[PDB]
Amino acid sequence: EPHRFPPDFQWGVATSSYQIEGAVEADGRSPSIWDTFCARPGAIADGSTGAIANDHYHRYREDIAIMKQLGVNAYRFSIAWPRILPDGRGRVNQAGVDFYERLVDSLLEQGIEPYATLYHWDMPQVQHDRTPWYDRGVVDAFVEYTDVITRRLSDRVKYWMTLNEPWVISFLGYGAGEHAPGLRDKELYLRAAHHVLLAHGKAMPVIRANGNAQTKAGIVLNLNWVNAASDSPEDQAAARRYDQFFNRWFAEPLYNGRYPEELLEWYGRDLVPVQPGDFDIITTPTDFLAVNYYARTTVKAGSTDPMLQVDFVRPPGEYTAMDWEVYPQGLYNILNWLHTDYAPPALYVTENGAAYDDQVSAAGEVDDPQRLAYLEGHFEAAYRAIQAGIPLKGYFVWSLMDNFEWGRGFEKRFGIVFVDYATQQRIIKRSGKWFSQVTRANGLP
Amino acid sequence: EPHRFPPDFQWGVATSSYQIEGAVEADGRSPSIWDTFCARPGAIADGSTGAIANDHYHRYREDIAIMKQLGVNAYRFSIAWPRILPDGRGRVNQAGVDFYERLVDSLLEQGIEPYATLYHWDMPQVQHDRTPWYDRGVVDAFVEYTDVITRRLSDRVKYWMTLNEPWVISFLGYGAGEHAPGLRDKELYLRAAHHVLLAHGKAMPVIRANGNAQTKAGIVLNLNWVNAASDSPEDQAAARRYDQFFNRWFAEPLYNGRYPEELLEWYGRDLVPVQPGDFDIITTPTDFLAVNYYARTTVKAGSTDPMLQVDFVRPPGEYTAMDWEVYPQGLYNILNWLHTDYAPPALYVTENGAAYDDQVSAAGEVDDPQRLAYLEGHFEAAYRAIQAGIPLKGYFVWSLMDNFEWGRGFEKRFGIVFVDYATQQRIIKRSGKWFSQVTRANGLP
Ligand code: NI
Numbered sequence: 001e002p003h004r005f006p007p008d009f010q011w012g013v014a015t016s017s018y019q020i021e022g023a024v025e026a027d028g029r030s031p032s033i034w035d036t037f038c039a040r041p042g043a044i045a046d047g048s049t050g051a052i053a054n055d056h057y058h059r060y061r062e063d064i065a066i067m068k069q070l071g072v073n074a075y076r077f078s079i080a081w082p083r084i085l086p087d088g089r090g091r092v093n094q095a096g097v098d099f100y101e102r103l104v105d106s107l108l109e110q111g112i113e114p115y116a117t118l119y120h121w122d123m124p125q126v127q128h129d130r131t132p133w134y135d136r137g138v139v140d141a142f143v144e145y146t147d148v149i150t151r152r153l154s155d156r157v158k159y160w161m162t163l164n165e166p167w168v169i170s171f172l173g174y175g176a177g178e179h180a181p182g183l184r185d186k187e188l189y190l191r192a193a194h195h196v197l198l199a200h201g202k203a204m205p206v207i208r209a210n211g212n213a214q215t216k217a218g219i220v221l222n223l224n225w226v227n228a229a230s231d232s233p234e235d236q237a238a239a240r241r242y243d244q245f246f247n248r249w250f251a252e253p254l255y256n257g258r259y260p261e262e263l264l265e266w267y268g269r270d271l272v273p274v275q276p277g278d279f280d281i282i283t284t285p286t287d288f289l290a291v292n293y294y295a296r297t298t299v300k301a302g303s304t305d306p307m308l309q310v311d312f313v314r315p316p317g318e319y320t321a322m323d324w325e326v327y328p329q330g331l332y333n334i335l336n337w338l339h340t341d342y343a344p345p346a347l348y349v350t351e352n353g354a355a356y357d358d359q360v361s362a363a364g365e366v367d368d369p370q371r372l373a374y375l376e377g378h379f380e381a382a383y384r385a386i387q388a389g390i391p392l393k394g395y396f397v398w399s400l401m402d403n404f405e406w407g408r409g410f411e412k413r414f415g416i417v418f419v420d421y422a423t424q425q426r427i428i429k430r431s432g433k434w435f436s437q438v439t440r441a442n443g444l445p
Numbered sequence: 446e447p448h449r450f451p452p453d454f455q456w457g458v459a460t461s462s463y464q465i466e467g468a469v470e471a472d473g474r475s476p477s478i479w480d481t482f483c484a485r486p487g488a489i490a491d492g493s494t495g496a497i498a499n500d501h502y503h504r505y506r507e508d509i510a511i512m513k514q515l516g517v518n519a520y521r522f523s524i525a526w527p528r529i530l531p532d533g534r535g536r537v538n539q540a541g542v543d544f545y546e547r548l549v550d551s552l553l554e555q556g557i558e559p560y561a562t563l564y565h566w567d568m569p570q571v572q573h574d575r576t577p578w579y580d581r582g583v584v585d586a587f588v589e590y591t592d593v594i595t596r597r598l599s600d601r602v603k604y605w606m607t608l609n610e611p612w613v614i615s616f617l618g619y620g621a622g623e624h625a626p627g628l629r630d631k632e633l634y635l636r637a638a639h640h641v642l643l644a645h646g647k648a649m650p651v652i653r654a655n656g657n658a659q660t661k662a663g664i665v666l667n668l669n670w671v672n673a674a675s676d677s678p679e680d681q682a683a684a685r686r687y688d689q690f691f692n693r694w695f696a697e698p699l700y701n702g703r704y705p706e707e708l709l710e711w712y713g714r715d716l717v718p719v720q721p722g723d724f725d726i727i728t729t730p731t732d733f734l735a736v737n738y739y740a741r742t743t744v745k746a747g748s749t750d751p752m753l754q755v756d757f758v759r760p761p762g763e764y765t766a767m768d769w770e771v772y773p774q775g776l777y778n779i780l781n782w783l784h785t786d787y788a789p790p791a792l793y794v795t796e797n798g799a800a801y802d803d804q805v806s807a808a809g810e811v812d813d814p815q816r817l818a819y820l821e822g823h824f825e826a827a828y829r830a831i832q833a834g835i836p837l838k839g840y841f842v843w844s845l846m847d848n849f850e851w852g853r854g855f856e857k858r859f860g861i862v863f864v865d866y867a868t869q870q871r872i873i874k875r876s877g878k879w880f881s882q883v884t885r886a887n888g889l890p
């Protein structure tokens with residue numbers, strides 16, 4: 001049954017720098033906000049840090065060989081600002097730039113297209129000391145960083161992502177206190193959210209300028225399918241607020257030059273530090289929109305989250321180890337919504353995947369049928385989306401291998417490749433072996 | 446009935462620091478004389494250096510796991526003076542000490558006994574600038590280094606070797622110009638030879654004092670079986686001079702407090718800078734004598750080596766890729782000579798092995814029957830020595846894996862484990878798989 005994807009479809013896997021690289025003091029790297037945050041009691045559920053991680057800084061070539069086994073034609077990673085500009089600004093760290101040159105050279109040598117994320121949450125601590133995301137001066141700082149690295153890599157890297165998951169950077173970082181730098185303030189989150197958008201917009205012309213005609217760039221948004229727990233007006237309203245908060249807070253500014261009004265009013269409109277011309281910057285044209293999709297979230301009115309006055313409900317269904325509902329149809333729905341409402345020239349699924357408890361068998365294999373079924377359903381939903389004329393150009397599985405899952409530490413494994421953290425051994429999981437077939441087939445089954 | 450070795454016999458593999466570690470600039474390491482010497486045109490046959498080597502500095506855990514596969518109960522390695530005291534003297538480099546602590550801890554955790562060589566040719570360049578081996582001040586410099594590292598590791602390392610192959614350090618380094626520092630002078634070689642012996646003697650009481658009742662220490666001598674090309678007086682005399690030059694120059698001082706007199710006269714006795722009390726120092730009692738044996742060397746009167754007035758002959762037989770004659774009987778003869786003439790309380794074969802051209806087969810294996818046959822014959826010779834009552838306590842194969850073979854570069858492979866230098870992949874060779882059975886059987890199948 002030829003459920004084949006388009007002939008140039010990009011099949012990849014995704015990682016982020018602090019999640020896999022380790023080697024946190026190597027070669028002039030300065031501490032990121034995450035290096036500092038992991039020190040805080042209760043911040044990381046298993047008490048771990050990203051100090052070693054997958055040790056990908058040293059093991060990249062081996063990982064690239066794994067990718068060859070996987071059959072991917074694309075690889076999404078992030079570049080660590082602390083390696084490039086350890087003082088946050090000013091002097092370029094040659095050694096740091098050199099790592100990414102070696103990585104990109106190795107990828108292209110193996111026929112793997114590099115998709116580079118500029119910012120995936122690891123701002124140098126020294127830069128955050130000067131300009132936290134709630135401080136407008138952060139925009140120029142991120143742009144300087146973008147300029148340095150893009151000038152060095154634009155000859156080899158064609159696809160760039162500006163910032164990964166604005167909602168996470170702003171809300172979790174500054175609103176819920178769950179991610180670095182670990183603050184919890186509604187105003188700080190809204191300021192951070194606005195400045196992330198501004199940084200994305202100011203960065204785009206820089207990327208295009210340091211590139212060539214082939215250069216493509218966009219932002220990466222986390223989106224999930226949102227449902228109301230019931231038909232009650234309070235629940236419909238709760239769902240609508242959460243949807244505006246999670247899914248529309250960035251998309252509407254990016255495409256329509258406005259924040260969702262009802263949520264804006266509810267917050268207090270003056271808390272967003274919009275200045276004249278900001279929306280013109282924010283709406284700067286992009287080549288694509290990248291989407292990170294994981295789950296359906298079902299909402300009712302309540303007090304669990306005091307800021308939005310909502311509670312979360314779990315419909316009967318299948319759940320991952322992250323307590324996230326498995327809802328493959330949600331991916332189709334999100335792609336369709338973006339395509340009908342904003343009409344981006346191209347879409348990419350830059351992240352999709354699942355965490356389940358994995359064990360290594362006596363045979364030395366990792367049998368993960370739940371994760372495989374998860375991936376299968378979502379790939380199917382993406383295939384349906386393409387058949388419906390949605391311009392989905394690629395799909396990147398989160399993640400290549402198990403890694404530091406932020407506040408959950410190393411306890412939640414998202415990889416299609418298992419990592420034994422005692423020895424750094426990599427074992428391709430059953431889902432990974434299956435994926436090796438999908439990529440070569442292009443794709444299902 | 447099986448040819449079984451004694452129940453506590455130590456089966457091991459051997460390496461040296463510059464040959465395997467790489468990471469030449471890491472963690473405060475300063476350049477050794479070999480880092481400088483590799484820069485010299487014509488010094489290394491394939492134009493290589495030890496800058497990366499086997500990358501064992503990073504890959505030690507993996508290598509140790511290979512050792513477990515091999516079934517060894519002992520591991521001989523060397524410690525890099527440039528890592529421990531990068532300025533040659535004075536400030537201890539704790540990161541350097543730390544690598545060796547982690548290496549030893551990991552070995553003991555796997556039940557592998559560490560046998561540590563203090564000096565295996567890598568003097569820090571900065572120290573050599575102050576005290577080359579021909580300068581008597583080198584003795585106190587080596588003793589300082591010995592003291593620092595033996596204090597840090599004596600609780601875990603019981604077996605220590607002071608200096609590896611005095612003949613090489615002095616003759617190849619200062620007499621033939623073939624090894625670092627690359628000088629070619631008879632006087633400089635003899636001064637160096639004498640100071641190495643003195644460094645060995647001064648070091649012993651330091652190692653004993655920093656240790657406990659279990660501490661065992663000795664020197665490591667290269668010895669080969671020597672034959673005269675014919676019965677002519679000129680050939681006998683040539684063979685005698687070579688024997689005295691290669692085999693007796695160090696052994697006679699160590700055990701009898703004298704240099705071989707005829708060769709001494711031949712050179713000019715004033716060139717050896719012997720001072721009163723030196724022989725009392727050189728003869729300080731040792732726990733064992735370690736032996737590195739490879740070949741039979743056949744000599745005739747000739748002008749090829751002008752210093753000794755000798756030529757070398759190749760008898761009909763089997764030759765390795767180093768152009769060294771395979772003569773397993775020689776190993777027994779050497780051990781028997783040392784046992785009868787000097788009666789050391791214990792003997793170890795700290796090095797024995799062979800270099801043959803290896804290829805990786807399409808099946809991904811390395812089939813090396815010539816290396817296997819070499820090892821078998823020599824192990825048999827060692828078995829015979831033990832049956833004759835020679836107190837051989839252990840046997841270390843040179844080497845665990847292919848490595849930087851000094852002046853021959855990476856082109857000569859001595860390992861029972863193949864290294865693909867493009868990726869650092871280790872493939873246990875056929876000889877290695879065979880050895881995996883010998884260690885477990887504790888004798889020859
Ligand atoms: Ni169909």
Ligand code: NI
Pocket residue numbers: 448
């Ligand atoms: Ni027999």
Ligand code: NI
Pocket residue numbers: 026058471503
């Ligand atoms: Ni390193």
Ligand code: NI
Pocket residue numbers: 718
């Ligand atoms: Ni003198």
